[PDB]
Design a protein around this nucleic acid. Structure first.
Ligand SMILES: [Mg+2]
Length: 851
RNA sequence: GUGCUGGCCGCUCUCGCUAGAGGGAGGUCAGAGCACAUAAUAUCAAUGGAAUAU
DNA sequence: TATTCCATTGATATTATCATCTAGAC
DNA sequence: GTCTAGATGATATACAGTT
């Protein structure tokens, strides 16, 4: 009902409504706001003031003192009510009596089946079984186990229940009624049970969300403080002193600034540098200790200082939440409210008994929808259809497969434009077989034996590489117990390829022009930027820029006029591209990504151009625009990419992906480029789309999955001029391979290996511990260097990278030497040989295999 | 059902004019295939522009 | 190279998406 | 009967270069 079901949702537009629906909705929202605000004060939370960006705050003690005045003598009852409501679950399903005026308490506990079977089996149960059964139930725990034994022995179950039922009644079910009579709580409709139930559960949801957020926030602050306090060295003190000195000159620190300043301080300089204040401060005697520090220590000190600066920036408490926006109001079938669903020829009719009827329209998402009524649920059957708004289009209509789901609740919500929407959250049912093998077997370093015994004897698996160009590179294989082949699945057996590595979709013809357009936009931006500077000091623009600007036909020759001619020409081309791609439905995804990049650049060009007249000293801030067209196009592209991958892999069980990193902090130089791929949300969408078809997804370690040889495990050199080719040197021969089919193959190799074989590490964690225990004798070992950089593990080095190439560990230097050897060999234009990874003459894939 | 496109004409703004470029609302003429898990709250990091300094 | 102000975007955590007894009715 | 509405319901699946 909940363990093996997958929830999804979609909306229907409410065309019209009868009865007093709007009054009911408005009353619910107003009471939600009021009582959420009140119960936030009953639970004395600290919070930061919103008006001054959290400079000041209200301590928990002041909130506690104000609560003592607000509640008075009901102080203790409210605390118990709040504890029960915050814990949640079934023991708190009777809190709606805080609002309901006609609430009546039953004086006996419910005769549930779990207690029927307990009482009916008292005769045969020994004392140890009895005490172990009732040590977790708070109702049954009200009676000692020995008394249970005498009751079972001397009395019949029919009279046992009568003797016991009043004794084990839950005494926290009457707390709300105690508060309402004592504080005079009144809601808008105190004689409607469903109204009170819905209101209480919505308010409780909001308060529980804030409770969990608040506690994790207060925990994380202390965690950060302890982590800062555990790392204290001399370099940290020196870096703190250096950072303070720079802030007095309004300069501030950075990793590049510190590193390059230390680099440039040793060498005497003549020409002034971009980082000159830092260099001048670094040449002072009091920072001599920074100039002789080792790189690892300097990096660690910088990291600790960065953590300290982030820690000092946090507020004391989170903001008080804003309750003003509307909530989705849920109504169900066993008590929350009452609704009936009727699918008609042209409408969907939702019947709320005494709050009117809602008439809704049909979707193409819920195509050919039918609903069948069952005792406490609806069975939904529908399909997806193409929406073609053009009446006479040449596209042949398509229809998807059937979908069967279970519906038990509905939601109602109002959009800010004044339209009402009905949400239908349904649940799909699939076997939890594929999702448990992915989480318990393939994500574990050492799976337990009973997991291994339950695995099937055959599997189909896949792997894929995702990039900004040639978006997807997939590979499909089949593994099984008792099979033979090049692929070795750890703890499971062997397997052989089904569909070798390839590139699913190459880039389109229009990708070349969409880069020239962005180059032109950036060049115009530079022209504007230097025109302003030359205007300020009464100089003249350089001849190169004037020659470039004069290439477009213009009605004048002054620079401002030439820059405006260039901007008009550049947007005539962007609009043409947008129109042409929208005409076809955005067939190519790489072209769409390039178009998005060009549009983003053009927006900055316009923003710069609008401020082309400002005078020194005066600032101009950004102006708010209520535009959401870019966010709806960017989202459409991510969903379309997730669909291509899931459509390719529709017959697999497990799919392997590398866990990519999202945009980074200020120290990264290319995080504007990775915001455009935007990888983490793409992975989320891929997981959601695979999960709708009962396919498991695993994320494997990514370091070195683009540098090892899939066949022999040797390192290669990836060309800098062209990133789509990688070169290897084996058997005194030079070989070349595609660097996207190498990534997919290495991802498949690491997935089948549970990511235990490392690419590089420091002289541990579960993966490295298992690798050390299996490849070598034991996990408690030390390392000594030998020969020309090879390492021998013995049962010394500290803090050094060690790489695994070809089955042996090697030191950092030998890895550099091998890559350099390949580089010098290729620089001499030595002809290489093409190797295909889908060859059927390959006898073993040795990449990331330690056994 | 939700989402994503241009040309042309007035009006109205900001900037410039040896000269035009851009924004907003509206009218009109066209274009239009393939995706869809729906919400509330909180928190962190960056992107772009402008001014300032070595 | 750095600082400050605006508005917008990527990402990650919480809260959610009912079942079964009982008392009245008719 | 069988409805249909209100008050009450045992505990709990990993790991740490890449775009
Ligand atoms: Mg790649």
């Amino acid at each position: 009902m909940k363990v093996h079901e997958i929830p999804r949702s979609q909306l229907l537009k409410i065309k019209q409504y009868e009865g007093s629906f709007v009054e009911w909705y408005r009353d619910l929202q107003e009471d939600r706001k009021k009582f959420a605000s009140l119960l936030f004060r009953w639970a004395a939370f600290g919070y930061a003031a919103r008006e001054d960006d959290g400079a000041t705050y209200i301590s928990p003690s002041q909130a506690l003192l104000e609560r003592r005045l607000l509640l008075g003598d009901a102080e203790d009852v409210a605390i118990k009510f709040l504890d029960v409501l915050f814990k949640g679950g079934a023991p708190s399903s009777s809190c709606y009596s805080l609002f309901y005026e006609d609430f009546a308490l039953r004086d006996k506990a419910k005769y549930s089946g779990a207690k029927r079977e307990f009482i009916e089996g008292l005769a045969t149960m020994p004392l140890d079984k009895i005490i172990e059964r009732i040590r977790q139930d708070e109702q049954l725990s009200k009676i000692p186990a020995e008394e249970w034994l005498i009751l079972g022995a001397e009395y019949s179950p029919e009279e046992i229940w009568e003797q016991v039922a009043p004794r084990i009644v839950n005494v926290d079910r009457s707390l709300g009624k105690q508060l309402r009579e004592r504080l005079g709580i009144k809601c808008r409709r105190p004689h409607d049970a469903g109204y009170c139930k819905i209101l209480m559960e919505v308010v409780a949801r909001q308060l529980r969300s804030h409770n969990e957020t608040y506690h994790e926030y207060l925990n994380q602050t202390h965690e950060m403080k302890t982590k800062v306090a555990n790392n204290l060295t001399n370099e940290f003190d020196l870096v703190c002193e250096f950072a303070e000195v720079l802030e007095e000159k309004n300069y501030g620190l950075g990793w590049y600034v510190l590193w390059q300043g230390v680099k440039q301080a040793l060498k005497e300089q003549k020409k002034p540098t971009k980082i000159q204040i830092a260099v001048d401060q670094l040449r002072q005697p009091k920072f001599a200790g920074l100039l002789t520090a080792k790189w690892r220590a300097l990096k660690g000190a910088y990291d600790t200082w960065k953590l300290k600066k982030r820690l000092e920036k946090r507020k004391a408490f989170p903001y008080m939440p804003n309750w003003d926006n509307d909530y989705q109001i849920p109504v169900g079938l066993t008590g929350l409210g009452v609704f009936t669903l009727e699918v008609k020829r042209t409408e969907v009719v939702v019947d709320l008994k005494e709050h009117g009827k809602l008439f809704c329209s049909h979707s193409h998402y819920f195509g050919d929808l039918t609903a069948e009524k069952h005792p406490s649920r609806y069975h939904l059957k529908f399909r997806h259809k193409l929406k073609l708004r053009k009446r006479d289009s040449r596209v042949e209509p398509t229809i998807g497969p059937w979908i069967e789901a279970a519906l038990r609740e509905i939601t109602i919500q109002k959009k800010p434009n004044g339209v009402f929407y009905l949400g239908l959250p349904y649940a799909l049912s699939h076997g939890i077989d594929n999702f448990q093998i992915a989480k318990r077997f393939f994500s574990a370093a050492k799976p337990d034996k009973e997991v291994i015994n339950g695995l099937p004897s055959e599997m189909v698996v896949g792997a894929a590489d995702l990039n900004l160009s040639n978006i997807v590179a997939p590979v499909k294989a089949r593994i099984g117990k008792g099979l033979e082949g090049p692929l070795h699945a750890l703890d499971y057996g062997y397997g052989e390829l089904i569909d070798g590595p390839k590139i699913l979709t190459p880039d389109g013809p229009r990708c070349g022009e969409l880069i020239s357009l962005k180059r032109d936009i950036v060049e115009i931006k530079s022209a504007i930027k230097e025109f302003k500077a030359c205007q300020r000091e009464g100089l003249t623009m350089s001849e190169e820029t004037t020659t470039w600007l004069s290439e477009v036909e213009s009605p004048s020759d002054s620079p401002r006029c030439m820059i405006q001619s260039r901007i008009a020409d550049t947007s005539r081309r962007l609009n043409s591209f947008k129109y042409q791609m929208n005409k076809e439905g955005y067939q190519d995804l790489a072209e769409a990504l390039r178009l998005l990049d060009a549009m983003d650049s053009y927006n900055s060009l316009l923003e710069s151009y609008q401020r082309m007249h400002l005078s020194p000293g005066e600032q101009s801030p950004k102006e708010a625009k209520f535009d959401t067209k870019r966010a709806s196009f960017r989202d459409l592209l991510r969903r379309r990419v997730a669909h291509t991958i899931v459509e390719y892999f529709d017959d697999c069980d497990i799919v392997f992906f590398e866990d990519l990193d999202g945009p980074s902090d200020s120290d990264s130089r290319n995080n504007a480029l990775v915001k455009l791929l935007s990888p983490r949300t793409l992975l989320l969408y891929i997981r959601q789309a695979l999960e709708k078809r009962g396919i498991g997804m695993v994320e494997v370690a990514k370091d070195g999955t683009s540098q090892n040889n899939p066949i022999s495990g040797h390192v290669g050199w990836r060309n800098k001029q062209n990133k789509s080719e990688i070169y290897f040197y084996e058997d005194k021969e030079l070989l070349v391979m595609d660097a996207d089919e190498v990534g997919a193959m290495n991802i498949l190799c690491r997935g089948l290996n549970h990511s235990v074989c490392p690419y590089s590490f420091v002289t541990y964690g579960k993966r490295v511990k298992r690798f050390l225990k299996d490849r070598y004798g034991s996990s408690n070992v030390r390392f000594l260097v030998a020969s020309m950089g090879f390492v021998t593990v013995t049962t010394a080095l500290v803090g050094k990278r060690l790489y695994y190439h070809g089955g042996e560990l090697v030191t950092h230097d030998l890895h550099n030497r091998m890559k350099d050897e390949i580089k010098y060999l290729v620089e001499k234009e030595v002809l290489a040989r093409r190797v295909s990874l889908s060859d059927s003459t390959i006898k073993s894939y040795k990449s990331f295999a330690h056994v």
